[PDB]
Scaffold this active site. Sequence first.
Site, PDB file in Angstrom:
ATOM      1  CB  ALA A   1      -2.186 -56.633  64.417  1.00 25.20           C
ATOM      2  CB  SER A   2      -4.818 -58.535  60.872  1.00 26.25           C
ATOM      3  OG  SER A   2      -4.432 -57.285  60.321  1.00 26.25           O
ATOM      4  CB  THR A   3      -5.124 -61.835  65.809  1.00 30.47           C
ATOM      5  OG1 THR A   3      -5.181 -60.857  66.857  1.00 30.47           O
ATOM      6  CG2 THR A   3      -3.679 -62.136  65.437  1.00 30.47           C
ATOM      7  CB  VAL A   4      -9.005 -58.049  66.374  1.00 27.87           C
ATOM      8  CG1 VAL A   4      -7.792 -57.901  67.248  1.00 27.87           C
ATOM      9  CG2 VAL A   4      -9.020 -56.971  65.291  1.00 27.87           C
ATOM     10  CE  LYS A   5      -7.597 -56.780  59.300  1.00 28.77           C
ATOM     11  NZ  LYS A   5      -6.609 -56.869  58.205  1.00 28.77           N
TER      12      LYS A   5
END
EC number: 3.4.16.4
Length: 538
Positions: A273-277
């Site tokens: 999820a948004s940890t990759v952003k």
Amino acid sequence: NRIKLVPIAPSRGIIYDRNGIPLALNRTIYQIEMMPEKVDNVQQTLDALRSVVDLTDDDIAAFRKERARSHRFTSIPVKTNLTEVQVARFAVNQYRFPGVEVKGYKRRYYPYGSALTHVIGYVSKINDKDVERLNNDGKLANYAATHDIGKLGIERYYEDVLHGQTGYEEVEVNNRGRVIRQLKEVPPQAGHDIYLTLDLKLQQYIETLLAGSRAAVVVTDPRTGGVLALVSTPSYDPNLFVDGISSKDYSALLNDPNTPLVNRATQGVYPPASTVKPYVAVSALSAGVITRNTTLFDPGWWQLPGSEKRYRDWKKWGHGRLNVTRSLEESADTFFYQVAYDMGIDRLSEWMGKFGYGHYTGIDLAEERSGNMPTREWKQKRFKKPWYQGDTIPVGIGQGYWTATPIQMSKALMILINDGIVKVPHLLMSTAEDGKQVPWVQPHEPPVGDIHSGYWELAKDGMYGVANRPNGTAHKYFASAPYKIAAKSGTAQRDHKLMTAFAPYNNPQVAVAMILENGGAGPAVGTLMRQILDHIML
């Protein structure tokens, strides 16, 4: 009189934390045993041993059972876990029991129990699959007298160095085959001691923090890539396995729906999820698909060109005008939908591969899953269908076909901290060997992108913003910390709650990737992350 060669099992190496605290140790267990063939009068011997070692009817029952379930010329145990009093009584009576031997076996001992189950592992009885693996690896000769083996964790991965070299003795035997004397002894060499990067105190803090949550935590030092804590909860007592696990107890672990046998830190596979952003952002900048100044208006959704399909932002009516900095701060989805579109799956998967996603991390545990960084070729091979443009869009926010492990999240987080320098996450600090101390060697891993660009700073400033600025998603957890925290959260699929963070923002000393499955059994992942970073920095 025959001279016989007999192997001598080596002493298993000790495992130490980063402060020299021993985490896995050896206890000597004493038992008396006999080959009933070699004993002149078994029933006479058993009864006389009631007085000498407190042999019970129950002991004799188990012996008799084991006499059948065993082959000819097996040494059947008569009484196990003798007290040292009982060993002494037997010793001064040894001459009355020809053919009864008293023997000591080193068993493994785990003083800190469930706090280190998945990372340290346990050793237990060799089975036929272990024989196969040893035989196929050409190691079986060196296990002539070894009956236990590392089954997971460090104990398994470093089995070869922890095990040592088998020795042997020449012994004289008479008729009926009883040992008279030892002629020569080439002693074994003990396994090397192993010094780990783990901090026992931090590991126990974290396990106690997690309580009855299904969770995983990886704490690393980004300067080294050393793993300071690797926790998966719920855990269990590794000591249960060392002297054989009860079927009642083992079935209790298999049947547990909270799956305590899974190492969630290295085998837990989740949408990152948004940890990759932050890493997508660095990748887009580096690829030139965005600039620090690129903006778009977000109405709370984003439509795929040439299609009616719309992809929602978590914020119903949008974030208004967004650059990359504000999109990281607020974990904007719409902005990264667009970045995914413009990158295309080919470039996006190639860049996220450079961050380690979809790949084994290099960590020195053998229990690990690689997750999935989707590609065109993968979707073709896995489903027959070709890649559609709409498949690219959710990859932009760590969803879609994208799955990762918390240990993979830790490796990518450290790359970002180190401006593209790739440090493998590892537990080994050094091996004793003699003690000829040998430190762990970071395998050559080329860096990610350009060290001397300012994209790394831009992405981390967004993570600083996440944790400190008032619009940041994580302000309620991290803003009031004295030291500066930088963080990035995510939500998967209740819903898994993920959090990456590092501290202090200045010169980071610690990086943490963690996940609470379905929100955990108590606090929020943001609160637990603040507590962990507080504990570490005090």
